[PDB]
Design a protein around this ligand. Sequence first.
Ligand SMILES: [Mg+2]
Ligand SMILES: [Mg+2]
Ligand SMILES: [Mg+2]
Ligand SMILES: [Mg+2]
Ligand SMILES: [Mg+2]
Ligand SMILES: [Mg+2]
Ligand SMILES: [Mg+2]
Ligand SMILES: [Mg+2]
Ligand SMILES: [Mg+2]
Ligand SMILES: [Mg+2]
Ligand SMILES: [Mg+2]
Ligand SMILES: [Mg+2]
Ligand SMILES: [Mg+2]
Ligand SMILES: [Mg+2]
Ligand SMILES: [Mg+2]
Ligand SMILES: [Mg+2]
Ligand SMILES: [Mg+2]
Ligand SMILES: [Mg+2]
Ligand SMILES: [Mg+2]
Ligand SMILES: [Mg+2]
Ligand SMILES: [Mg+2]
Ligand SMILES: [Mg+2]
Ligand SMILES: [Mg+2]
Ligand SMILES: [Mg+2]
Ligand SMILES: [Mg+2]
Ligand SMILES: [Mg+2]
Ligand SMILES: [Mg+2]
Ligand SMILES: [Mg+2]
Ligand SMILES: [Mg+2]
Ligand SMILES: [Mg+2]
Lengths: 95, 240, 244, 98, 75
Amino acid sequence: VTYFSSRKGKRKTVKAVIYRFLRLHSGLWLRRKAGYKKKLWKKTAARKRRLREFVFCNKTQSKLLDKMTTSFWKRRNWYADDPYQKYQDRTNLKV
Amino acid sequence: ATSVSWKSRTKYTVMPVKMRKSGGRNHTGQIQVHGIGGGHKQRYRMIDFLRFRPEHESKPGPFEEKVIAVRYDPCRSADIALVAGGNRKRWIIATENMKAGDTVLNSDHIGRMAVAAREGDAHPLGALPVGTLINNVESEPGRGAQYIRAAGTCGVLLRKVNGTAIIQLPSKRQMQVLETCIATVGRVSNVDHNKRVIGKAGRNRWLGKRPNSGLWQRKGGWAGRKIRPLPPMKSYVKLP
Amino acid sequence: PLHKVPVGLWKQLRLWEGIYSRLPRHYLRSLEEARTPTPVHYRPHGAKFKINPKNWQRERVEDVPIPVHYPPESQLGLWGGEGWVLGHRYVNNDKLSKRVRKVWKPQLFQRELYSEILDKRFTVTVTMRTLDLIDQACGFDFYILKTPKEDLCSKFGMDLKRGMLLRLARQDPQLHPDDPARRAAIYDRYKAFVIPEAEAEWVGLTLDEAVEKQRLLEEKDPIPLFKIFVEELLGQLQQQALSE
Amino acid sequence: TVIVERWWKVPLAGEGRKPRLHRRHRVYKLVEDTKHRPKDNLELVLTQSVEELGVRGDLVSVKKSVGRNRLLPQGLAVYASPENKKLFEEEKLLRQEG
Amino acid sequence: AWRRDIFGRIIWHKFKQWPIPWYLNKKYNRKRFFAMPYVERFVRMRIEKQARIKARKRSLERKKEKFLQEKFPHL
RNA sequence: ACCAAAGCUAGCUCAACAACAAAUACAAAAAUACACCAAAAUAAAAUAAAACAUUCACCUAACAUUAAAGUAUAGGAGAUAGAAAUUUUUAUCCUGACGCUAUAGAGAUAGUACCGUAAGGGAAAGAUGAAAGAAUAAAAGUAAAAAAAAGCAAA
RNA sequence: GACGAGCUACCCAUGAGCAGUUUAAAAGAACCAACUCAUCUAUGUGGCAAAAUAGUGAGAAGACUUGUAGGUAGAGGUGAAAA
RNA sequence: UCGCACACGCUUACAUCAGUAACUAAUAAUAUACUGAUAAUUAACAACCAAUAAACCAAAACAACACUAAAACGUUUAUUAA
RNA sequence: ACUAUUCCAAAAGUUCUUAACAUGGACUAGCAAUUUCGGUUGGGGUGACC
Ligand SMILES: [Mg+2]
Ligand SMILES: [Mg+2]
Ligand SMILES: [Mg+2]
Ligand SMILES: [Mg+2]
Ligand SMILES: [Mg+2]
Ligand SMILES: [Mg+2]
Ligand SMILES: [Mg+2]
Ligand SMILES: [Mg+2]
Ligand SMILES: [Mg+2]
Ligand SMILES: [Mg+2]
Ligand SMILES: [Mg+2]
Ligand SMILES: [Mg+2]
Ligand SMILES: [Mg+2]
Ligand SMILES: [Mg+2]
Ligand SMILES: [Mg+2]
Ligand SMILES: [Mg+2]
Ligand SMILES: [Mg+2]
Ligand SMILES: [Mg+2]
Ligand SMILES: [Mg+2]
Ligand SMILES: [Mg+2]
Ligand SMILES: [Mg+2]
Ligand SMILES: [Mg+2]
Ligand SMILES: [Mg+2]
Ligand SMILES: [Mg+2]
Ligand SMILES: [Mg+2]
Ligand SMILES: [Mg+2]
Ligand SMILES: [Mg+2]
Ligand SMILES: [Mg+2]
Ligand SMILES: [Mg+2]
Ligand SMILES: [Mg+2]
């Protein structure tokens, strides 16, 4: 992470985080499961199903991924047809 | 930084000219060739290697010259002879038995019956007999003598083809030369130069040779006894 | 502290003061504006807009010229506007391999060129490209008059241009002294290129040559004070004789 | 002539500001070479009769080797120039005339 | 004459009297009046150095005016 | 009681605005004899990548300022690097100081002493008064005033 | 990127020394001074000295010592190799 | 018992008169080396101080003559030289 | 990179050649560059293991 850039003096973003993850507006980060394209003929139907699925990251991670991302990716987004738009709000959460 | 060479002289003098030796260094003052220097101080004595050299530009004909003296030279391994005729004196390389009070003939003329030559004789290659013994052989006609100058060496005339002679150099490589090239007939002086013993290391520093390095090196692939098929004939005749 | 004006403009405000101010305007105007040199080594792509292969969006695409080097010998010949390309390369062309410093030198030839206007045969070092352009322009003299300053790159080319342009504007009788017919012919087909006289002699110069020529045109050894005093006294005497 | 390309994309300055160059913009791949290209034909017009090639007043296609070092220097041929082609429209229309 | 000498200064060159023309005089030939490219950098530095000694002389004369005026309640 | 101690100035920061004359490149400081002149080839690495090979901003240029944006993109797709299209900016005047006081602030009382063959390195210091055309006794260290069984030196 | 071969390594110029004694002899011969080296021991060790002094030693017309002045410069020079 | 000169190199440290409480001498006395004032080495020695043509193969070594390792060094004639 | 080598283009000419320079791309060597030399361990090495 670059905390102050050379030319603009701003705070840079790590792009390798932007390619594998997704930030919902609740703050949950959403990631693929490692090795899902890898050696399928070995694995059971069960394991294949477990691998195709998307999953959520623990607090320690979401926190870390947040530090590597600027304000622009924490933004509220309305896309036409957005699949995940139905998932971006949190409901019935009594902490 | 800089240097100036010692070899500037425009005119031919038989009086020995003072020479400045440079051990091993090029004009930028760096060692180029190792192991040279500190010799005994020597004067240089100019040699005329073009033996047929008409003295007065007007009259073309052949020379008759006389041997005044035979001296040692520090610069070369062979012995030098002082030869005069007309108003001219020259240092030429002496042939083996040449003595003071001698007569020498120089001609560029080629007759069909050839000639029988003494040692102090200089003739065009094509005018000599097929078996004869030569030295101070010239490469291209008018260029002067180059090959076979060293102490007690000789070339030999082999065959003649199309007005072009073939000679055998001391290394036994064969040389192709135009007939009009002048050569001297005989052996170079002081044939015993090869058998001289250098007694101590001292003689080496007298001849101006430095000791070798103390660095030890494995012999490389280059070392061993290689037996090569003899290098092919050198041809100084150019095609039309 | 600071500088009242930035340094890139120091080099410019050099011209606005002193003897440079007395140089002819046309010279200055020609020096300032630099038409961008015709691409030689790098290869341009015409369109201002491109379509990104991966991105699928129109992309504003610009052209950056490759820096080339002109050795001092090149300034003496005609190289067609080219020179040494200094750079680095990747061995094998895999970006993952070793990067290595490299210089591409242009190939030089010794050739002779014929001038109609200068009526001479020159021995010039030329490149292939030089002969190509000499070809496409249909004359050596055409090649020199039809080309801008940035494309020749040589002091020799521009002094060639200056020489023969001067010869055109003077209408010199020395060109083909005995044949008015060949004068007519030779001068006629270049008559497209005629420039006036005061312009022709300043066209090939370098700032040092300009400064020097200007210096020489401006040399006047100071008038004796005796002269000016005599003039003033005569003026006074004539005004006094006229008032009476 | 060597035609050359850069390995690394250069950023843009479009407002007329000059492009800002870095050291990584100095690696070059060699795209093309001019001297390894096949040669073209030189279109010329003959002022006289050349042995093999042509009769007086004819259009010839040579190669730059023969063309540049023989015809044009000796005054045998002139360039394809349109102004020089009108000359042989003239000579050709006055040829079949008389 | 006015000359630009080796060090890039501008100098007043007093002439001398020689028995022979300037292109034939050895010593006069190896005297260089002109500057080289690298001198351009040094040329800048003293322009800059001078500019400081001037700039901070001003700032002394300023202070002097103030002290005196607070030390001597004039008028 | 000695040794000492105290001054407030020399000047600095940062920022706005904009004595000739002669002598000199002979071995510089030597009036005077035959020549020659003059010249140019990418910045590299230290370091980041917890190693290190591709790669590593800033280091040349100007372009400024508010944004587009740390976005498009570029990257052993790692570390990191990073635009543009398109947008914003009212005049001068109006100079100063929550800047330093002699181990500070300039290296500067100086590029001097001195140290280097040489490129180069490079100090230390001043204090009475209107008038010298008037003559506080507070650091350590000591002195006034050697030391008397025993022991972290005191409680 | 500069600056260094006034020390030392090796060269290039131009100079200068070498008495006596022995031997037909200037013979990389003897003996032994000047001159050159540095063997061995003891002193010295913030020394008299950032390598000395006292004795004792090797060589001493030669691959000898030595003066003035040039030259080669660090990715290099020079080297009777001791990195 | 490393004495007098010159070369190189140092720069007034030298000379006369005066003063030395304290500075230099590794102490004193007094002073070639500290301080002040004043002077001083004088050219025949030494430095600076022509070119171009042409003849001239012939070692220094007490030099007869030689040795091998082949040896530094100029006269004279001609043309001009304030 | 350089110094050499051998080859193909280029360049000049022939109807296949290369005098000396001399550029592009290869090759084969010399001289030569840049960078590293894993870890556990009854100290490290050797042995063994990961
Ligand atoms: Mg020899
Ligand atoms: Mg040997
Ligand atoms: Mg050996
Ligand atoms: Mg913009
Ligand atoms: Mg690292
Ligand atoms: Mg670290
Ligand atoms: Mg490391
Ligand atoms: Mg860098
Ligand atoms: Mg201070
Ligand atoms: Mg000094
Ligand atoms: Mg006290
Ligand atoms: Mg007690
Ligand atoms: Mg030297
Ligand atoms: Mg020396
Ligand atoms: Mg003796
Ligand atoms: Mg002996
Ligand atoms: Mg004893
Ligand atoms: Mg002995
Ligand atoms: Mg003995
Ligand atoms: Mg030795
Ligand atoms: Mg060894
Ligand atoms: Mg060892
Ligand atoms: Mg003296
Ligand atoms: Mg004393
Ligand atoms: Mg690297
Ligand atoms: Mg290990
Ligand atoms: Mg270990
Ligand atoms: Mg163990
Ligand atoms: Mg243990
Ligand atoms: Mg093991």
